[PDB]
Amino acid sequence: SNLNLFYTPSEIVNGKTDTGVKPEAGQRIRVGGMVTVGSMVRDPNSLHVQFAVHDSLGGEILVTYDDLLPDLFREGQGIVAQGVLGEDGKLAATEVLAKH
């Protein structure tokens, strides 16, 4: 069907997404990890937003988002972010759930 599972950012860095060895771009997954407190950056366009999400394991992944985030993405918490592998490395996410 489609592997909409929750995967750690570290996973999708260490010889996976980053390196394009296992998950090819264009697939859906959900990254789930902790928001780097000072990595939420936004366009003045006010409709393009991107952020870095990592783990204690220190494998930071970059997520891109092309609409207004919900709670402006309150930083310094965990979140789960779903969409599609966009630019073969970057996740084009949109279904973010601040379930944390």
Domains in the chain, please, with CATH? 1-100 (2.40.50.140)
Question: HEC profile for 71-99?
Answer: CCCCCCCEEEEEEEECCECEEEEEEEECC
- How was this model experimentally determined? NMR
DSSP letter, residue 76: S
d(CA 3, CA 48): 26
In terms of Cβ atoms closer than 10 Å to its own Cβ (0-12, 13-18, 19+), residue 3 is exposed
Contact between 51 and 73 (Cβ < 8 Å): yes
CB 29 within 8 A of CB 81: no
Binding residues, by number, are: 100
CB 66 within 8 A of CB 92: yes
Phi, psi of 40 (to 5 degrees): -70, 110
Instruction: With beta carbons less than 8 A apart as the criterion, state whether 36 and 52 touch.
Output: yes
Known binding site for heme: residues? 100
Distance (Å, rounded) from C-alpha 60 to C-alpha 52?
A: 6
73, two tokens: 């993405």
